[PDB]
Scaffold this motif. Structure first.
Motif, PDB file in Angstrom:
ATOM      1  N   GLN B  42      41.686  17.246  60.851  1.00 58.58           N
ATOM      2  CA  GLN B  42      40.508  16.499  60.629  1.00 58.58           C
ATOM      3  C   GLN B  42      40.444  15.262  61.787  1.00 58.58           C
ATOM      4  OE1 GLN B  42      40.672  15.802  55.838  1.00 58.58           O
ATOM      5  NE2 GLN B  42      39.054  16.738  57.049  1.00 58.58           N
ATOM      6  N   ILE B  43      41.032  15.363  62.887  1.00 55.93           N
ATOM      7  CA  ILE B  43      40.676  14.604  64.172  1.00 55.93           C
ATOM      8  C   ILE B  43      41.498  15.213  65.166  1.00 55.93           C
ATOM      9  CG2 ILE B  43      42.316  12.621  63.871  1.00 55.93           C
ATOM     10  CD1 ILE B  43      40.111  10.813  64.475  1.00 55.93           C
ATOM     11  N   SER B  44      40.977  15.089  66.275  1.00 53.48           N
ATOM     12  CA  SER B  44      41.614  15.871  67.532  1.00 53.48           C
ATOM     13  C   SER B  44      42.711  14.988  67.843  1.00 53.48           C
ATOM     14  CB  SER B  44      40.620  16.018  68.762  1.00 53.48           C
ATOM     15  OG  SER B  44      39.410  16.728  68.372  1.00 53.48           O
ATOM     16  N   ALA B  47      41.968  12.296  70.331  1.00 51.06           N
ATOM     17  CA  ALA B  47      41.057  11.360  69.434  1.00 51.06           C
ATOM     18  C   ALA B  47      41.634  10.348  68.827  1.00 51.06           C
ATOM     19  CB  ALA B  47      40.004  12.173  68.463  1.00 51.06           C
TER      20      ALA B  47
END
Lengths: 48, 48
Positions: B42-44, B47
């Protein structure tokens, strides 16, 4: 040229219609149509 | 800082650190370890 003048009020109404037409365009850039953010550059640097 | 001392606890007894107001430099931590598997959902991974 005051508030009781109907023709002057009509002139102001036409100006306000122009302004509202522009304001609706300028206002929908802050809308978030079911997304995590309204800024494209923000969702770009947060998801995959 | 408390992460770098003692006997770290087993998996079922994992300790927790909640940070609600601070500035974090994570690579200033991961430099101190030899990272092996960085997997994120749900996030790189970059990131975070």
């Amino acid at each position: 040229f005051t508030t009781t003048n109907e023709a002057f009020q009509k002139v102001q109404d036409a100006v306000n219609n122009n302004a509202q037409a522009l304001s609706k365009l300028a206002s929908e850039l802050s809308n978030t149509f079911g997304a995590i953010s309204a800024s494209i550059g923000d969702i770009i640097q947060r998801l995959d | 800082s408390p992460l770098l001392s003692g006997t770290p606890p087993q998996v079922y007894n994992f300790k927790r650190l909640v940070f609600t107001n601070c500035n974090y430099n994570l690579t200033k931590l991961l430099s101190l370890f030899s990272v092996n598997d960085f997997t994120c959902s749900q996030i790189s991974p970059a990131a975070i």
